[PDB]
Amino acid sequence: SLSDKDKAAVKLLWSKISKSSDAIGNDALSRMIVVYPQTKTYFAHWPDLSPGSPHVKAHGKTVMGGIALAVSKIDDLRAGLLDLSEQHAYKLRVDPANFKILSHCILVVISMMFPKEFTPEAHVSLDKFLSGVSLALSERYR
Amino acid sequence: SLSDKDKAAVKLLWSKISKSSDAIGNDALSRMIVVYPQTKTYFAHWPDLSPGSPHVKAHGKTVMGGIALAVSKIDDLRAGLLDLSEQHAYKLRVDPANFKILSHCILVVISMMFPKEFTPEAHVSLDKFLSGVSLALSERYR
Amino acid sequence: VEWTDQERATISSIFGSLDYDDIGPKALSRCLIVYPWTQRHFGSFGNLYNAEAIIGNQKVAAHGIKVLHGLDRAVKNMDNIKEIYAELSILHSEKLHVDPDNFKLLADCLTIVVAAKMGSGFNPGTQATFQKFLAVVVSALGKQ
Amino acid sequence: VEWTDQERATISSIFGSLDYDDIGPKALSRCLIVYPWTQRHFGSFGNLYNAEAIIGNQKVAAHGIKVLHGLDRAVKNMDNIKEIYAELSILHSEKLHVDPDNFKLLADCLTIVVAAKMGSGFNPGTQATFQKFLAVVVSALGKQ
Ligand code: HEM
Ligand code: HEM
Ligand code: HEM
Ligand code: HEM
């Protein structure tokens, strides 16, 4: 569970990075599909994610829009993200082993793009948050 | 021909950018081979230049080392770059239509990486310089 | 020329992201500084003796903004560019006597100014589509 | 594991570029903050009650530097990693009682610290090779 300090930390970091959220999302998805090639099947329909290809802001905004939703619903992630759990489990059938993978790639991108703001305190709170998001997303799978 | 102001301008810009010269070189070569695909044949032997692949500092340093040479020999580019003209014309047989292409891609990279320092005055002097380098490199072709 | 949906989106995305009142004056002024013979048809009253004078010239600034607005018609109708620019091509050749080579020089300066604005986002594929689009426009304008 | 020449070069390049006295303390301190059960085997005398205390802890800083120096042996001999780490694996299991899971957590923190240092240079392929290398090391160390 997220403490009030954690929730404050997540909101503060988000206030600093949300303006680059399309870029964060594109960068995280692109590295996920390369580093973790079992994931390419989920995004082969978005060939813009191939390195070197022009960036589609709406593709990055998709995933980071989910994170923005989670920041707004940070007091009750399970209820907040229940529809997105259904989408991933039923509609898309994303293997749930991948939520922790995308989480890691988001942390890597944030560290690369915002090294001053991504302190170890920012990282622990954001990591707890993303564990929370991944568990919420995993709710409908079984 | 380069004026004393031009030579000063080129030296000053070079003093600001030379520390990133491996990165400049890699970025310029990689975009050249994508934007101008007739050039891929020259660099297919360096698969590191594919977008997303790990960067080989020595590959970027190759081309930008030629530019560094040219900055040191800026009072007499034809004599300074004559050996590199022979390498490109005879050893490698690079089509000389490509010197102006790589020149443009170097300017694009510099503009992307050093937008504050790449003023229009910096650009005119650097462009004249790179026209000079391309002509020097073209010397041995016919 | 043939255009894919991906390419049409990229061009729309790039141009949507630009502040034409900033980028236009920057591109034309840069062209008049790097290729100073492109001053030929400006400075009929004032002088253009250095970069500060060219960047300060109001008519040059205004025209760089007109160039960017002029490119909008092509952004929105990428498969009719030749036809769209037929009247502006006649204006620039028959009335203004602009050399057709000057359009290629301006296109390069615009690419260098857009690259500075987009930073690392101006990756190889982005540059490829952007330059393809300008090349089509340059070809339509440079008809005599 | 099999390694290509390209991969061996990348690992050499990444590690050559790092200041171990800066990156080592950063990676271990970060691990003790993000995964605070990894304090278990530190703080035998002083306390580690917050991030400032952990980053200020001299023994933690010194050990992060030892971790980076320890990775050098693998950088230089990528095809014998299991054998190279056999004595340090015994030390960390039999004498120190470090959980083998803790090596994976430290590897993630090291990747996040190296990504911050390399910036955009830490592209997808670079991350792939770097994480493959750490994974091999983690597998050798985490033997009981
Ligand atoms: C932090 C974890 C994640 C968040 C916050 C997230 C968020 C979202 C959002 C908001 C959508 C849009 C749903 C809609 O159309 O309404 C989406 C779609 C999608 N997600 Fe995720 N997602 C996450 C993880 C994953 C993972 C791990 C994968 C695959 C490895 C995945 C693959 C997809 C795919 C394929 C779509 C459909 C995209 C499209 O064609 O529209 N997601 N996700
Ligand atoms: C600004 C223009 C250019 C400069 C300053 C430049 C500089 C150099 C330098 C210094 C070398 C190393 C020569 C050596 O081994 O001693 C080199 C090699 C090479 N250049 Fe260029 N070059 C230029 C343009 C081009 C262009 C336009 C092409 C092709 C489109 C090209 C393709 C090559 C190739 C293929 C090599 C061999 C690389 C290798 O395998 O070692 N160069 N160049
Ligand atoms: C994509 C390239 C370009 C576009 C879209 C463009 C567009 C325009 C437009 C919309 C006008 C106003 C037309 C009118 O009177 O109603 C104009 C005027 C003008 N353009 Fe361009 N132009 C371009 C390139 C150039 C270049 C390269 C030059 C010269 C180097 C140039 C020189 C002029 C001049 C001198 C006028 C002023 C005419 C006057 O005072 O009556 N243009 N341009
Ligand atoms: C790649 C991973 C790691 C490497 C290369 C590494 C390397 C080393 C080395 C070289 C030493 C000194 C050995 C000696 O006494 O001569 C050491 C000591 C130690 N390591 Fe690690 N280590 C790693 C991971 C970890 C982790 C994850 C933990 C705990 C979370 C840890 C806890 C310790 C402790 C407590 C000691 C001190 C033992 C003492 O005071 O005698 N190590 N490590």
Author numbering:
A (entry chain A), B (entry chain A): 1 to 142
C (entry chain B), D (entry chain B): 1 to 144
Paste lines from the article.
Here, we report the structure of a second carbomonoxy form that presents several structural properties that are unique for globin structures. In the α chain a striking rearrangement of the heme pocket is observed: the side chain of the distal His59α, which assumes a canonical location in Hb1EmCO_ortho, is far from the heme group. The most evident one is the strong electrostatic interaction established by His59α and Asp48α side chains. The displacement of His59α produces a rearrangement of the distal side of the heme pocket characterized by a movement of the side chains of the hydrophobic residues Phe43α, Trp46α, and Leu29α that, compared to Hb1EmCO_ortho, become closer to the CO molecule. Interestingly, the rearrangement of the overall architecture of the distal side observed in Hb1EmCO_hexa is unique among vertebrate globins. The inspection of the RMSD values shows that the quaternary structure of Hb1EmCO_hexa is quite different from that exhibited by Hb1EmCO_ortho (RMSD of 2.16 Å). The evidence in Hb1EmCO_hexa of a stable carbomonoxy form in a T quaternary state is in perfect agreement with a biphasic CO-dissociation kinetic and with the stopped-flow kinetic curves previously observed for the Hb of E. maclovinus.
The superfamily of globins includes proteins that are ubiquitous in a variety of different living organisms, from bacteria to higher eukaryotes, where they perform key functions essentially related to their ability to bind gaseous ligands. The globin fold is made of six to eight helices that constitute the matrix where the heme group, which is deputed to the ligand binding, is anchored. In this scenario, we have undertaken the biochemical and biophysical characterization of the Hb isolated from the sub-Antarctic notothenioid fish Eleginops maclovinus (Hb1Em) that lives in the Beagle Channel surrounding the Tierra del Fuego (Argentina) by experiencing temperature ranges from 4 °C to 10 °C32. Particularly, Hb1Em exhibits the Root effect (drastic drop of oxygen cooperativity at low pH) that is physiologically necessary to secrete O2 against high O2 pressures into the swimbladder or the retina, following local acidification of the blood in a counter-current capillary system.
